[PDB]
């Protein structure tokens, strides 16, 4: 019954910045994870709350596919109960995650010479991020007790910082494309399971 449009997500020309991670709903299809391989050297595929070996014998009300890019040393922060700049400011995952993540290197395709400024991450925030929340405001974040009336300068920095991806970066510093599939199931008809 039709194949899930995983190409439109994994083969997408450009991935959104981590601070503005996309969200594509996938439903009314069959999840054929077999074809997912042979697409770049994947760096991480670990699942919580569901045994991958049986993934083809169950399906859910829907699944949300959130795609973004982060540096390798940072990918470990995409997990329930984790802490870090991404975990508290850009992308926060609930402790009861019913789903899992996929990460693959994209240095050859997403690391411009001299620095790729197309990707930004939120380095400052007043408070942590609630699970599955999106923040895009670029208001000047004051750090000290001196209000700056929204002017960049001393003790008042721009919240977003552009990733400086370069070919000569470290082994773990190169960009990594991450796609998180959150399986949401309720008392509703199931939508996305592969061959039995």
């Amino acid at each position, epitope marked *: 019954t039709n194949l899930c449009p995983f190409g439109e997500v994994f083969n997408a020309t450009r991935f959104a910045s981590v601070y503005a991670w996309n969200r594509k709903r996938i439903s009314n299809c069959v999840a054929d994870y077999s074809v997912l391989y042979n697409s770049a050297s994947f760096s991480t595929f670990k699942c919580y709350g569901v045994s991958p070996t049986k993934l083809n014998d169950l399906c859910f009300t829907n699944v949300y596919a959130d795609s973004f890019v982060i540096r390798g040393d940072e990918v470990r922060q995409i997990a329930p109960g984790q802490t870090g700049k991404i975990a508290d400011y850009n992308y926060k995952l609930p402790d009861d995650f019913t789903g899992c993540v996929i990460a693959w290197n994209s240095n*050859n*395709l997403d*690391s*411009k*010479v*001299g*620095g*790729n*400024y197309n990707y930004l991450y939120r380095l400052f925030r007043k408070s942590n991020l609630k699970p599955f929340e999106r923040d895009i405001s670029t208001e000047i974040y004051q750090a000290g007790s001196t209000p700056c009336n929204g002017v960049e300068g001393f003790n008042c920095y721009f919240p977003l910082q552009s990733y400086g991806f370069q*070919p*000569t970066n470290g082994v773990g510093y190169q960009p990594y494309r991450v796609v998180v599939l959150s399986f949401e199931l309720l008392h509703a008809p199931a939508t996305v399971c592969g061959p039995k």
Partner: antibody
Amino acid sequence: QVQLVESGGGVVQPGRSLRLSCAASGFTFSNYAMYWVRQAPGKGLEWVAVISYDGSNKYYADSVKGRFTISRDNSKNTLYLQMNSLRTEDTAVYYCASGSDYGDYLLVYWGQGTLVTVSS
Amino acid sequence: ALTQPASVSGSPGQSITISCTGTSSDVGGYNYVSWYQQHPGKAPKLMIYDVSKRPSGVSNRFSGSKSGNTASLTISGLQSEDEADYYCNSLTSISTWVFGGGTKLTVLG
């Protein structure tokens, strides 16, 4: 297919200005970093210059540091290299490489390239 | 720069290996080498993408490999039409795109 055409330039006197233009088509210019690579007649290749995908950052080979200037414009889809204070040893054929998808640290397309002769 | 053999010769059919070496910074630490084949009076075009890979449309026979500090290209069953110059590239620190130098293949015709 993707085309890259160099404006070129005839024999010029040593220590004189010269502007070379590389026009590209068939692919998105404004998302990749061009390179200028010279080849002396009968010798091997030698990287000359590279410019970032937006012109913010430019790198030159030590041999041409402080004499060349590589720029680009995306409005008309073109790349420019300005040569000042030429030297006789600089005569060579210049190639305008692209660094297309799946690699930007490497040169891929290698357009036809023009010839520049520096003789008095 | 990099060091390469001045010239390599071999009859058609067998395997031919061309090796280029550099300091740790050029290829010893960075695995970004890529080899180009330039025919006489022609624009060089990529042959070996990355340390060991090949862009779509090129011949399967060519194969890149890396042994520690050295990078090698292996050609299986080369024909007469493979007579051309071959250069090994490398991305070093602080940019500085070094080049292999010169290497010519000939067929015992």
